[PDB]
Structures are given as structure tokens and as C-alpha cells.
């Protein structure tokens, strides 16, 4: 998990969603998983 | 495939329909381009083997008095127009049909009437 | 070229100034002026959304037909006042014209076609001047760069003009310049 103020879809299979007030990027590649903070 | 492109394609099928002595319709799903090449080369002497959108073919089917074929345009569809002869074309399909088993005959149009799948088979035999 | 004039409704302003123009724009209107050989300017107001529609499709030098409280008038767009930031139309100068009259107009030139792959096309002059009939102004002018090789100057004298259109600007304007595409080493020495 990467915690940065800016989250972006690194690859073509990343999706941006919104859980519990955060903005999150979820991918099948565990490296690309990241959240905003 | 804009409004004119769809209008262009329906004219060609109608144009390619009247110029053919007879026609047979088949479904082709599962055939590799290598398999499609062999069938086309075998049929390349007289017949032309093409596919198109079912809705767009039905509009081309309204140009000719063939209104009995509207039920043959469901599922994948390949229409094989025969430029000459009738025995040669059907037989070339049968030797292919009994080899790949992925191509089956939906029906055929002749003498102003739709011809049943079995009755199409008798053209090659006779 | 025969253009059917665009019909627009115009209202004569009752109050002018900077307090009255700001209020007019707040109601989706644009102040306008109608001078020409009538030699007595008329202060008009035009619909903002209807005026922008005419300019969007028929170009900046659009011929108009104003309904000034029941009187038909043929008018031509002469100039526009556009805000740098908000990108509005703050004003519009309108020139009266009549059929069979020659006017001096700047039209845009477009560059179509793909040249030699090792070239970069640079357009120097955006527009050129012509002298055409009032209702026969071309909407745009085109040039072709197809197979043009290396360093050539396409000049304003070689633009293909329709009939009844005469070039006003001198025939030595460098309109399109085709040159060799810069390399990576030529990029790093430009602007250092």
C-alpha cells in the first residue's frame, strides 16, 4: 500500500473507487494498490 | 460504418444477389481463417462465400422477391452465392462439412422458394 | 459562392454607457453598432446565444440580416471584442452592405495533406486578404501539402481562389513553410 496525497491508475487494469471517505486505487497487481492520505 | 457505409453495404449484397443463379446460407462459427481459406479456395472456381450483418442482409433481401428467407438470419450467418452450376458448389461444401464439423447448412433458395436442409443436399447427389 | 443570409433579431438600445452594457450582457445580450454607407450609426442589441451559433458554423465574416424593429437590413460582421480570459463576445461592429458590392475581407487558410515524413510544416501567416462580393465571401481557403519536399515556401500568390475573388495582400506573403524536421540536437540549442 502506498499512502500519498495523489493516487493514479499506474496500469491499464487499475480502478479508482471511494471507500469510507478515502480515494483508493485497487488492482490485481499488489504493487499498484494505493490510497490517499 | 456510418449511415452511408451501411447504405453502401446493403446495395452490394442486393447487387451480388441478383447476379447469382442460386444461393445457399450457412453458419460458420468456430472456423479459423486457415480453415476459411481452404473452403474459399475450393469454392473459388464459381462460388463466392461472404458474411454480413443479418439486419443489413434482410434489407437487401427486400430488393428481391425472396421473402421466404427471413427466418434464416438468426445466429452467425454466411451466404455463399453460386455464379455457375449447382452440383459443384453443394458437393464442395459437403466434403468440407464432414471434415471440420464446425460448418452446417442453414438452408437454400432456388426456383423462387426456400429449399429445406435435406432438399438442398439432393442437388449434389442428382 | 451564394450564401443565404442569417436572420437575427435586433433591438435598438434605449440607454448606452458602461453601466448599461454590463447589464445587457448579464441578460444574455451583446451591444452592437451598425454603420456603413448609411452614415448614421445604430446602437443595437443581439441575442448572445443566437449570435454565437451563427459565428460557430458560418465563420467570423458571416453575412447577416437584422430585423431592426420591423425593418430588414443586410449587414456584415466587421469586428469582434472577445475577452482574453472569459472568452466572451463583448461587442460587435456591423457594416451595412448591398448585393453587388465588393468588400475587403480576411479569410483563414487551412493546411491539408501529409508531406514527406522527414519534414515539419510551419504556417507563418494565419489569414490573407481578399476582395469579393458582399454575399460571395468564401468561408475558408485551403492549401495542399502532399508530397512537398524539403524547404519550400508556399506563398500567398499560389492560393487557389474561386471566381470573383481577387487577392489584395501582396503575392509575396510566406503563408506555409515546409522545412526539415528538427532533430534532438537541434531542439536543445533553440532557446538556451
Amino acid at each position: 500500500m502506498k499512502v500519498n496525497p495523489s493516487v493514479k491508475p499506474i496500469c491499464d487494469k487499475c480502478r479508482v473507487i471511494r471507500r469510507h471517505g478515502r480515494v483508493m486505487v485497487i488492482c490485481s497487481d499488489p504493487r499498484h494498490k494505493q490510497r490517499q492520505g | 460504418m456510418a449511415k452511408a457505409d451501411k447504405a453502401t453495404a446493403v446495395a452490394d449484397i442486393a447487387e451480388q444477389f441478383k447476379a447469382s443463379t442460386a444461393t445457399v446460407v450457412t453458419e460458420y462459427r468456430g472456423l479459423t481463417v486457415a480453415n476459411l481459406a481452404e473452403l474459399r479456395r475450393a469454392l473459388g472456381d464459381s462460388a463466392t462465400y461472404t458474411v454480413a450483418k443479418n439486419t443489413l442482409v434482410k434489407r437487401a433481401a427486400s430488393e428481391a422477391g425472396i421473402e421466404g428467407l427471413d427466418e434464416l438470419f438468426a445466429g452467425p450467418t454466411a451466404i455463399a452465392f453460386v455464379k455457375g452450376e449447382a452440383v459443384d458448389a453443394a458437393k464442395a461444401i459437403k466434403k468440407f462439412a464432414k471434415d471440420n464439423k464446425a460448418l452446417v447448412i442453414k438452408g437454400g433458395y432456388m426456383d423462387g422458394k426456400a429449399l429445406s436442409v435435406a432438399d438442398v443436399e439432393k442437388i449434389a447427389d442428382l | 459562392t451564394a450564401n443565404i443570409p442569417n436572420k437575427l433579431t435586433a433591438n435598438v438600445r434605449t440607454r448606452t454607457g458602461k453601466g448599461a452594457s454590463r447589464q445587457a450582457r448579464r441578460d444574455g445580450k451583446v451591444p452592437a453598432v451598425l454603420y456603413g454607407h448609411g452614415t448614421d450609426p445604430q446602437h443595437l442589441e443581439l441575442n448572445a446565444r443566437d449570435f454565437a451559433a451563427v459565428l460557430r458554423s458560418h465563420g467570423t465574416n458571416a453575412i447577416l440580416t437584422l430585423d431592426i424593429e420591423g425593418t430588414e437590413q443586410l449587414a456584415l460582421t466587421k469586428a469582434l471584442d472577445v475577452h482574453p480570459i472569459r472568452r466572451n463576445i463583448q461587442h460587435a461592429d456591423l457594416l451595412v452592405v448591398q448585393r453587388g458590392e465588393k468588400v475587403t475581407v480576411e479569410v483563414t487558410v487551412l493546411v491539408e495533406g501529409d508531406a514527406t515524413p522527414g519534414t515539419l510544416v510551419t504556417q507563418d501567416a494565419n489569414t490573407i486578404e481578399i476582395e469579393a462580393e458582399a454575399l460571395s465571401i468564401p468561408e475558408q481557403l485551403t492549401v495542399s501539402v502532399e508530397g512537398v519536399e524539403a524547404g519550400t515556401q508556399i506563398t500567398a500568390g499560389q492560393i487557389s481562389l474561386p471566381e470573383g475573388v481577387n487577392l489584395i495582400s501582396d503575392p509575396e506573403l510566406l503563408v506555409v513553410n515546409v522545412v526539415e524536421a528538427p532533430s534532438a540536437e537541434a531542439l536543445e540549442e533553440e532557446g538556451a
Binding site: - | A37, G44 | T116, P117, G118
Partner: protein, 133 residues
């Protein structure tokens, strides 16, 4: 199916054929002996081989016509094509030469006519900077 290019005049080299089909459990010496026997009719043109193996590792190899890129290099006398086509052109080829390559590729192309097959070979000449006349 491993696509492999071995020149006709080379027998049992290490780089091309050594590690190619060795790792797959295929015979390393039995392929060449059948291959060299068939490829000794040409002896001067590199011809690719398509090693098609079966269940018992029996390979039904097929021989192919030399590539259309090679057949244009010696048809013009230059060893290697241009690295910057459309700017430098290595040589020239007459349109009558192009039909000759299309003749020896007749069993390996898509086209049915001879004019269509001529255009196919002319496409490969464009990519390597050979002017076709």
C-alpha cells in the same frame, strides 16, 4: 511449433539449432540429418524450418521458401538493406524481377493472381528502401 531459420549450407551448428529444440526433449542430431538431406538441393539460400512435433516427439518438419526480404537483397546486389528508408535507398529493382520472387513464393502467399502477388513483394521492398520499377 518452433519457427527456426537455418541456412541451407550449414550442418549442425551450435547457436541456431543447438539450444533451439534441445530443451524441448526433441532429438538434437536426428533433426539435422533429415534436414540436411532435404536442404542440400538448394545449398545457397537460407530456408526456414517449422519443427512440428507429435506425441512421441516425432517431428513432421516442413521446409519453406527463403524469405522475401533475402530474395530482394541478392536480386539487387546489396548485402544489407537501408537503415533509414525514404531517405537513403540502397539499390534498384525492375518490375520484371519482382514477379520472379512472387513466382517462387507462389505456394506461400495469399494472392491468387500474379499482379496481386507482385504488390505483396513490393511491400517488403518499400520497408528496406529498394525502389521498384
Amino acid at each position: 511449433l518452433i519457427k527456426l531459420q537455418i541456412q541451407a549450407g550449414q550442418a549442425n551448428p551450435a547457436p541456431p539449432v543447438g539450444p533451439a529444440l534441445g530443451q524441448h526433449g526433441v532429438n538434437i542430431m536426428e533433426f539435422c540429418k533429415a534436414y540436411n538431406a532435404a536442404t542440400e538441393s538448394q545449398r545457397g539460400n537460407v530456408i526456414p524450418v517449422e519443427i512440428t512435433v507429435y506425441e512421441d516427439r516425432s517431428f513432421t518438419f516442413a521446409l519453406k521458401t527463403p524469405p522475401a526480404a533475402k530474395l530482394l537483397l541478392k536480386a539487387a546486389g546489396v548485402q544489407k538493406g537501408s537503415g533509414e528508408p525514404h531517405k537513403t535507398k540502397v539499390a534498384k529493382v525492375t518490375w520484371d524481377q519482382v514477379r520472379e520472387i512472387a513466382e517462387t513464393k507462389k505456394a506461400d502467399l495469399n494472392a491468387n493472381d500474379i499482379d496481386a502477388a507482385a504488390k505483396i513483394i513490393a511491400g517488403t521492398a518499400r520497408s528496406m528502401g529498394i525502389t521498384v520499377e
